[PDB]
Amino acid sequence: VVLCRESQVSILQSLFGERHHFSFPSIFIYGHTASGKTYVTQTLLKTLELPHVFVNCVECFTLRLLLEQILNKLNHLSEITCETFNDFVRLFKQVTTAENLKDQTVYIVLDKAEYLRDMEANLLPGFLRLQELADRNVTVLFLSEIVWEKFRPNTGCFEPFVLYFPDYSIGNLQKILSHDHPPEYSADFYAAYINILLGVFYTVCRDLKELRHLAVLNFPKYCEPVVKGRDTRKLWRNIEPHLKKAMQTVYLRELPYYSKFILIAAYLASYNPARTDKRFFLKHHFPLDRLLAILYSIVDSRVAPTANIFSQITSLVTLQLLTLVGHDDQLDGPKYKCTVSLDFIRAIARTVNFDIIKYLYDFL
Amino acid sequence: HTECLSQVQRILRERFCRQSPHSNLFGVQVQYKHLSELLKRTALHGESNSVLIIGPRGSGKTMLINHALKELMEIEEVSENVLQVHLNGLLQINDKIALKEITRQLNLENVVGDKVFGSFAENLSFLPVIFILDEFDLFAHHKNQTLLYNLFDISQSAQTPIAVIGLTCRLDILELLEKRVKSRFSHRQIHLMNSFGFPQYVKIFKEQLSLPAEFPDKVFAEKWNENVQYLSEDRSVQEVLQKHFNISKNLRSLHMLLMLALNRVTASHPFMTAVDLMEASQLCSMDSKANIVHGLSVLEICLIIAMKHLNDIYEEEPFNFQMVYNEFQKFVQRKAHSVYNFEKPVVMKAFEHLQQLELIKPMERTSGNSQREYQLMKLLLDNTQIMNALQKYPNCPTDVRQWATS
Amino acid sequence: TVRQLESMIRLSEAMARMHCCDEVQPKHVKEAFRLLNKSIIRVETPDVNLRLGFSEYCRISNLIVLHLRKVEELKRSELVNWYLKEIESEIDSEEELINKKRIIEKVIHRLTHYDHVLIELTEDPYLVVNPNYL
Numbered sequence: 001v002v003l004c005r006e007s008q009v010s011i012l013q014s015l016f017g018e019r020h021h022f023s024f025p026s027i028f029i030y031g032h033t034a035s036g037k038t039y040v041t042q043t044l045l046k047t048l049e050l051p052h053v054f055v056n057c058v059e060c061f062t063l064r065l066l067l068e069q070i071l072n073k074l075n076h077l078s079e080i081t082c083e084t085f086n087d088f089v090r091l092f093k094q095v096t097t098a099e100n101l102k103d104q105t106v107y108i109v110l111d112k113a114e115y116l117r118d119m120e121a122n123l124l125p126g127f128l129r130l131q132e133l134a135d136r137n138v139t140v141l142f143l144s145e146i147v148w149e150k151f152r153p154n155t156g157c158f159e160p161f162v163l164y165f166p167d168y169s170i171g172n173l174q175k176i177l178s179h180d181h182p183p184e185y186s187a188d189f190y191a192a193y194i195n196i197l198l199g200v201f202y203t204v205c206r207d208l209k210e211l212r213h214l215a216v217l218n219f220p221k222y223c224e225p226v227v228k229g230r231d232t233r234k235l236w237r238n239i240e241p242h243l244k245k246a247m248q249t250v251y252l253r254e255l256p257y258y259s260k261f262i263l264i265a266a267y268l269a270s271y272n273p274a275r276t277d278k279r280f281f282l283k284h285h286f287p288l289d290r291l292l293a294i295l296y297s298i299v300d301s302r303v304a305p306t307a308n309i310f311s312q313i314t315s316l317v318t319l320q321l322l323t324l325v326g327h328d329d330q331l332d333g334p335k336y337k338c339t340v341s342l343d344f345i346r347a348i349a350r351t352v353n354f355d356i357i358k359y360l361y362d363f364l
Numbered sequence: 365h366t367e368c369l370s371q372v373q374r375i376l377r378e379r380f381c382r383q384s385p386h387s388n389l390f391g392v393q394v395q396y397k398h399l400s401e402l403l404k405r406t407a408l409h410g411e412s413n414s415v416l417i418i419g420p421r422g423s424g425k426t427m428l429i430n431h432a433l434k435e436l437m438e439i440e441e442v443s444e445n446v447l448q449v450h451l452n453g454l455l456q457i458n459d460k461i462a463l464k465e466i467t468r469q470l471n472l473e474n475v476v477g478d479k480v481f482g483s484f485a486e487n488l489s490f491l492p493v494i495f496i497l498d499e500f501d502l503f504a505h506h507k508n509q510t511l512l513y514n515l516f517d518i519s520q521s522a523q524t525p526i527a528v529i530g531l532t533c534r535l536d537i538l539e540l541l542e543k544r545v546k547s548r549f550s551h552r553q554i555h556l557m558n559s560f561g562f563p564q565y566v567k568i569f570k571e572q573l574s575l576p577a578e579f580p581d582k583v584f585a586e587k588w589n590e591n592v593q594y595l596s597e598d599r600s601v602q603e604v605l606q607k608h609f610n611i612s613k614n615l616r617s618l619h620m621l622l623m624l625a626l627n628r629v630t631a632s633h634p635f636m637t638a639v640d641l642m643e644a645s646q647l648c649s650m651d652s653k654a655n656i657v658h659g660l661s662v663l664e665i666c667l668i669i670a671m672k673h674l675n676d677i678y679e680e681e682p683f684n685f686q687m688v689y690n691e692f693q694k695f696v697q698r699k700a701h702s703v704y705n706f707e708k709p710v711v712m713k714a715f716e717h718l719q720q721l722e723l724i725k726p727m728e729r730t731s732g733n734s735q736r737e738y739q740l741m742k743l744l745l746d747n748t749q750i751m752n753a754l755q756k757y758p759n760c761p762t763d764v765r766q767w768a769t770s
Numbered sequence: 771t772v773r774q775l776e777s778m779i780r781l782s783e784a785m786a787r788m789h790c791c792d793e794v795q796p797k798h799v800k801e802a803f804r805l806l807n808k809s810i811i812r813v814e815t816p817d818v819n820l821r822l823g824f825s826e827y828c829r830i831s832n833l834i835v836l837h838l839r840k841v842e843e844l845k846r847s848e849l850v851n852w853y854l855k856e857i858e859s860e861i862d863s864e865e866e867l868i869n870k871k872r873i874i875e876k877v878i879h880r881l882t883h884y885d886h887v888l889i890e891l892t893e894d895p896y897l898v899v900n901p902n903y904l
């Protein structure tokens with residue numbers, strides 16, 4: 001069922017008209033992430049009991065897979081394999097002559113159409129003007145989050161009808177969340193739950209799926225106090241700290257000794273200009289050699305150039321902590337960059353008893 | 365009652381959506397006369413000609429050819445001798461596919477052969493047939509333009525009569541051809557421009573929404589004609605038509621607007637109203653960027669305001685995540701105790717979501733070497749657009765509004 | 771540095787001398803703390819929608835949040851009654867009373883529905899403070 005979605009449903013029902021009637025060659029529907037495009041369109045198609053083929057652009061990452069899946073599903077509704085768009089058009093003309101497909105509009109539902117512009121140049125113009133080429137009462141729908149302005153080809157083509165799905169509101173979200181209340185408690189109980197949840201998290205999280213997931217996760221702790229024995233103040237006081245703990249993660253859901261020195265030296269080399277190197281290390285007043293010199297300066301003990309330190313360097317490269325910049329064949333002048341956050345390097349420095357801030361030129 | 369509404373809905377939907385042929389022609393009398401005369405010359409005699417038709421997309425390029433063919437094919441038994449081949453630049457992208465389509469349309473696959481053999485001398489040695497070439501500009505982008513050169517050669521030859529018709533939207537089609545084919549191309553060009561004034565556009569609108577004389581109910585048809593005639597001189601309808609005519613003179617947009625207007629026709633309102641046309645025009649003329657901005661959240665609005673401040677302070681220069689975070693921290697730190705205590709990961713996820721909506725695009729794309737942080741980002745919006753969108757924001761807080769004004 | 775602390779003590783003494791009070795009270799310290807904090811200052815704060823100043827808006831918000839947080843260790847009408855009891859020392863006419871009633875109703879509604887600092891719990895709804903306001 002759909003709630004607070006009656007204008008678009010009526011518009012689509014008026015657009016469809018009767019089964020024998022014709023419609024637009026292309027309709028472009030765009031909206032937000034939690035707008036419910038798939039839900040609304042598929043529920044409407046199921047309710048009207050119309051011949052429709054549901055296709056995911058992601059699954060059909062190749063043209064042959066897309067065309068073969070479309071044709072096979074259409075045949076199942078009414079083995080065939082095709083390779084080219086012209087052959088697909090010819091076979092589509094051959095297959096659409098069924099009695100069940102004689103005086104009815106054919107609907108091709110496509111979702112996640114953002115990837116269509118990266119498949120082929122002429123595929124989108126071919127899909128847009130399908131009704132002219134086939135002349136067999138065919139309609140194609142589009143579902144996307146990107147506006148039509150970025151779907152326009154350079155040469156220009158047949159303009160589809162643009163449509164927008166309205167964004168949700170406080171009352172709309174509250175109705176949707178309170179519709180599926182648990183049968184084991186009163187509707188007003190779940191309504192109060194939804195009210196406090198919306199009052200807490202509507203500022204950041206407007207996603208219906210995510211807010212509903214949060215409610216599902218946190219409901220048992222909502223219902224514990226009453227089981228333990230309509231006290232609004234009692235519930236709020238018992239439950240408030242848990243809500244603050246939960247909000248800490250809205251969207252979120254021990255190196256060897258010499259490795260730490262290598263990491264801190266790499267961070268220093270990355271974030272310190274070379275002109276100030278002697279100013280920080282020379283006793284009196286990026287390439288691998290600079291790193292070696294800095295490492296030799298930092299460590300109070302004489303470290304031998306054993307191959308194990310080179311193995312540590314390569315392993316750190318593997319662990320995506322250090323990124324190789326130069327060519328792989330050039331292993332005599334290699335370039336590196338450090339991708340470690342500043343808080344991480346400060347934390348690892350503390351476990352070593354080293355003050356990295358005193359050597360950072362930028363802070364000074 | 366209901367049956368009449370259903371029938372008129374079906375007829376008008378067929379007229380607009382499928383673009384069914386109609387006897388009405390607007391400002392194309394001379395062009396159609398020339399094209400029909402030359403087609404008759406090419407049909408009744410063995411002479412060959414080549415013509416290109418140039419016009420903007422949606423200007424009824426195909427309609428002229430279809431009407432001329434329907435007028436001239438049925439003249440005599442010449443249509444029995446006349447053969448027609450239709451080729452579209454979109455379906456046929458390779459010369460092999462074009463040759464296969466030509467062979468299959470001529471029903472000569474039995475004569476030529478079934479296998480994938482590349483020899484085409486079976487047709488060439490044997491070679492009145494008319495050729496229709498949709499999207500003629502695409503054929504010029506082939507590797508060697510072999511098909512076009514062969515068609516021009518056989519047109520210039522004295523073996524068999526061949527008629528070549530091409531459709532092109534580009535105005536520079538003459539310079540997209542090679543020297544040889546350009547020399548062998550008969551310089552026959554027809555230009556399709558909307559060379560008519562606003563009153564003529566009003567007449568076109570009045571005629572298009574007029575019921576045909578073949579409708580069963582005659583008094584209802586006369587009342588519909590009276591309604592459309594009365595609606596013709598209404599100044600609100602004229603204002604909407606003037607706006608759409610200033611935007612573009614193409615008939616395709618007018619057909620779309622008329623179709624959308626007819627969607628709001630129900631039993632309770634058998635005859636249209638100027639308010640219906642106003643609603644259709646308003647729905648057809650909305651900007652998508654403001655609609656996208658309207659559906660955002662508070663944190664995204666604050667980030668966008670910080671982005672605008674960055675663009676103002678640093679005139680037309682890129683930016684990254686760290687500077688935006690630093691100045692958002694500055695804003696939330698100047699205020700004493702505002703409820704915006706958010707950590708780094710949530711702001712990073714918000715920035716990722718904003719980049720996903722393609723309001724921000726990277727420069728000189730690379731990955732691995734540079735993280736998502738420290739990446740050169742740019743905004744794809746205008747300051748006046750942000751101000752207008754924020755003006756219509758439902759529940760924009762005072763603090764963020766005053767920060768935006770600052 | 772300590773020089774600013776000495777300046778703060780001097781400012782408290784100046785406030786005490788202004789009011790002809792033989793002893794220094796913490797209200798002087800609270801008054802001087804703002805003036806020490808402000809630093810960069812605009813010519814005039816913009817109006818807030820009948821218009822009300824930003825400083826007064828912050829003052830009302832701070833007072834109401836402090837009272838609610840203190841009571842935590844209420845009702846809309848009860849809180850309005852407390853506010854009218856507290857502001858009695860300034861109102862001198864009935865027109866000022868009705869204006870203050872208008873202002874407080876508008877401020878409470880605005881904080882409830884735009885700034886989200888106040889959360890409604892189900893004609894006299896219970897009001898609670900958003901737990902992330904300091």
Ligand SMILES: Nc1ncnc2c1ncn2[C@@H]1O[C@H](COP(=O)(O)OP(=O)(O)OP(O)(O)=S)[C@@H](O)[C@H]1O
Binds near residue numbers: 038039
């Ligand atoms: N109008 C609605 N009425 C009822 N449930 C809805 C509505 N809109 C969304 N939902 C529910 O929310 C869920 C998530 O919405 P989606 O359908 O995933 O959003 P979407 O618009 O299809 O965006 P995509 O394409 O999936 S990224 C749906 O599966 C429904 O259960």
Ligand SMILES: Nc1ncnc2c1ncn2[C@@H]1O[C@H](COP(=O)(O)OP(=O)(O)OP(O)(O)=S)[C@@H](O)[C@H]1O
Binds near residue numbers: 422426615619
């Ligand atoms: N002179 C005309 N007489 C009648 N209808 C016209 C005329 N010019 C344009 N039209 C109409 O304009 C509408 C749009 O033209 P289209 O037929 O879509 O364009 P086209 O001829 O297919 O050209 P392309 O480049 O292939 S899209 C059709 O419904 C035509 O009937």
Ligand SMILES: [Mg+2]
Binds near residue numbers: 036
């Ligand atoms: Mg979906």
Ligand SMILES: [Mg+2]
Binds near residue numbers: 425426
């Ligand atoms: Mg055409």
